[PDB]
C-alpha cells in the first residue's frame, strides 16, 4: 500500500493503477527462478508501449512498497526501461506534487532511496525530481517528518555535489530553498546541527557558483539579509558589499542583483503544493467577504505554531510576485490580493515577523522600474494602505511610516536609487490608475500629523 487512508477517504485512482501494475509484475515473476522471471518481463515489455509502461510502473511501485525487493527491482527497471526511466520520473513528480502528505513513511523512505539511485545513475531529469522533492519541505515547520526530509535531501545534494554542479537551475533552487530553511533551524541541538550543514552547503555553492545563484534575482538579497547574523553569512555579506568581484568578475555590485526581478519559479518553490493550491483557490474563486472559513482552515493548518511565523513572508512574496490575476478576476468580486495581504499581516504576532513582512510586501517597490518590473508586484501594498484607511488606520499608518523610513535605511549608499524606486512605484500606480490620487491617502485628516508632515517633506509631488 502506497498511501495512508481512513475509512472516510475515497479510493485513490493513482494508487489503484500502480497497484495493478505491481500485480502484473509479480504475476510474471512469482514462483519462478529469476531467469524465467526476467525473461517474462523482457518478453512482455516487447508487446508495446502500455505493457512497457505497466512493467516500469510495477517495478517502481515494488521499490516503494517492498524494501527487501527494492535493489533488484531497480536493477531490473534500469534494464527493461526503453525510455531512460522517463515514465518513472514523471510518476515520481506526480506522487510528490499530488500525494506526498498521504504517502506512507516506508514509501517516503524508499522514494528518497530511489532518487539517490537515480542521481547516482545520472538519469535524465533527475535534477527536476530533486527540485520537486525540495518543494515538499515545508517552510515554518520543524516537525520530525519535515526535518527528516530536509536533511535527507541535503545529504543527497551534498554527497552528489559534482553532479549538482551540472545544473544551473538546481544550484539556484537548492540555494534558494536552504537559505530559507536555515531560518527555521534553531532551538535544539539537532536543528543547530542541521543548520550548520545547510549553511556550509549554501555558502559553498554561493562562493563557487555565484553567477548561477544570481539567476534568482532580488529575492536572493532578502534571503541573505534574513541570515545575515550567522557568522559565515556575516562574512559573505562583507564580500557582497565591499568586494563583490571575489564572488565573480561579472558581479560588480549588489545593485545589479537588486535591479533584477525574481522569476516565479523561485517564489513558488517555497510554498508546498497544498499551500499553493489553497492560496490560488482563495484568490481566484472565493468572493470578497466570504473568505473567513478558508482563512481559519489555512491558518489552523499552516499558521498556528510559533515556528510558522517565517512562512508569512513566503506567502506575501508569492501573493505579490506569482499571483497576477487576469483582468476578469480583477474586475470582479473575487477576494483581492490586498485583502489576503491584510489578513497575513495581522497574523504576524511577533515584531520581527511583522517587520520582515512589511519589507516583503514592499520589496519590489525599492528598485521598481516600469520596463523591468510589473505593477502587479507593487499594487498590493498601495491597496492595503488605501483600503485599510477607514477600517484599520493603524495598518495604513505603519506601512506609510515603513515606506518613508526604508528609503534612506535599506542600504544608504543606494538611497538615491531606493527613493527613485518608491517614486517610480507611486507614479506608476497613478498613471496606471490603480490608485488615481495619492493626496487623499498621504494628506488624510485621519493620519497622524507627524506622519503627514513626513510624507509631505519626502514626497511633495503627491500631497
Amino acid at each position: 500500500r502506497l498511501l495512508l487512508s481512513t475509512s472516510l477517504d475515497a479510493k485513490d485512482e493513482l494508487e489503484e493503477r500502480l497497484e495493478r501494475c505491481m500485480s502484473i509484475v509479480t504475476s510474471m515473476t512469482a514462483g519462478v527462478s529469476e531467469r524465467e522471471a526476467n525473461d517474462a518481463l523482457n518478453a512482455y515489455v516487447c508487446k508495446g508501449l502500455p505493457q512497457h509502461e505497466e512493467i516500469c510502473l510495477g517495478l517502481f511501485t515494488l521499490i516503494l512498497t517492498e524494501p527487501a525487493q527494492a535493489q533488484k527491482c531497480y536493477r531490473d527497471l534500469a534494464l527493461v526501461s526503453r525510455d531512460g526511466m522517463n515514465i518513472v520520473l514523471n510518476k515520481i513528480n506526480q506522487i510528490l506534487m499530488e500525494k506526498y502528505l498521504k504517502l506512507q513513511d516506508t514509501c517516503r523512505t524508499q522514494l528518497v532511496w530511489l532518487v539517490r539511485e537515480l542521481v547516482k545513475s545520472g538519469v535524465l531529469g533527475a535534477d527536476g525530481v530533486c527540485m520537486t522533492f525540495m518543494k515538499q519541505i515545508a517552510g515554518g515547520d520543524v516537525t520530525a517528518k519535515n526535518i527528516w526530509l530536509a536533511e535527507s535531501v541535503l545529504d543527497i545534494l551534498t554527497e552528489q555535489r559534482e553532479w549538482v554542479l551540472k545544473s544551473s537551475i538546481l544550484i539556484a533552487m537548492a540555494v534558494y530553498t536552504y537559505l530559507r530553511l536555515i531560518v527555521d533551524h534553531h532551538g535544539t541541538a539537532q536543528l543547530q546541527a542541521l543548520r550548520q550543514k545547510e549553511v556550509d552547503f549554501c555558502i559553498s555553492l554561493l562562493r563557487e557558483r555565484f553567477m548561477e545563484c544570481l539567476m534568482i534575482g532580488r529575492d536572493l538579497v532578502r534571503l541573505l539579509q534574513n541570515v545575515a547574523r550567522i557568522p559565515e553569512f556575516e562574512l559573505l555579506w562583507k564580500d557582497i558589499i565591499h568586494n563583490p568581484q571575489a564572488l565573480s568578475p561579472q558581479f560588480t555590485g549588489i545593485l545589479q542583483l537588486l535591479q533584477s526581478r525574481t522569476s516565479r519559479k523561485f517564489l513558488a518553490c517555497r510554498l508546498t503544493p497544498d499551500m499553493e493550491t489553497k492560496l490560488l483557490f482563495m484568490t481566484s474563486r472565493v468572493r470578497f467577504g466570504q473568505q473567513k472559513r478558508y482563512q481559519d482552515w489555512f491558518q489552523r493548518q499552516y499558521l498556528s505554531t510559533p515556528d510558522s511565523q517565517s512562512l508569512r513572508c513566503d506567502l506575501i512574496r508569492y501573493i505579490c510576485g506569482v499571483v497576477h490575476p487576469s483582468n476578469e478576476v480583477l474586475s470582479s468580486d473575487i477576494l483581492p490580493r490586498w485583502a489576503i495581504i491584510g489578513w497575513l499581516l495581522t497574523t504576524c504576532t511577533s515584531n520581527v515577523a511583522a517587520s520582515n513582512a512589511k519589507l516583503a510586501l514592499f520589496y519590489d517597490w525599492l528598485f521598481f522600474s516600469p520596463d523591468k518590473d510589473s505593477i502587479m508586484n507593487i499594487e498590493p501594498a498601495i491597496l492595503v494602505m488605501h483600503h485599510s484607511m477607514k477600517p484599520h488606520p493603524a495598518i495604513t499608518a505603519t506601512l506609510l511610516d515603513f515606506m518613508c523610513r526604508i528609503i534612506p535605511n535599506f542600504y544608504p549608499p543606494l538611497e538615491g536609487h531606493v527613493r527613485q524606486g518608491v517614486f517610480s512605484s507611486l507614479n506608476h500606480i497613478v498613471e496606471k490608475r490603480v490608485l488615481a490620487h495619492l493626496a487623499p491617502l498621504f494628506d488624510n485628516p485621519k493620519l497622524d500629523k507627524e506622519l503627514r508632515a513626513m510624507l509631505r517633506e519626502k514626497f511633495p509631488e503627491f500631497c
Binding site: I182, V183, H186, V221, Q225, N226, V227, A228, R229, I230, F233, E234, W237, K238, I241, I254, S350, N351, V352, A354, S355, N356, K358, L359, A394, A397, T398, L400, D401, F402, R405, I406, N409, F410, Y411, P412, D448, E450, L451
Partner: protein
C-alpha cells in the same frame, strides 16, 4: 515616554529570536526595528 529604551528592547528581542539584520527607528507607528542590509 521612553522611546530609546523601547528601541533597544525591541532590537535585543529581535537578536534573541532572529538571524536577520535590523536597525532601530524612533517610530511612533510600530516600526521600532527595520530589516536592512548589513552595515
Amino acid at each position: 515616554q521612553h522611546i530609546a529604551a523601547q528601541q533597544k528592547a525591541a532590537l535585543q528581542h529581535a537578536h534573541a529570536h532572529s538571524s536577520g539584520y535590523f536597525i532601530t527607528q524612533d517610530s511612533a507607528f510600530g516600526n521600532l526595528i527595520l530589516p536592512v542590509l548589513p552595515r
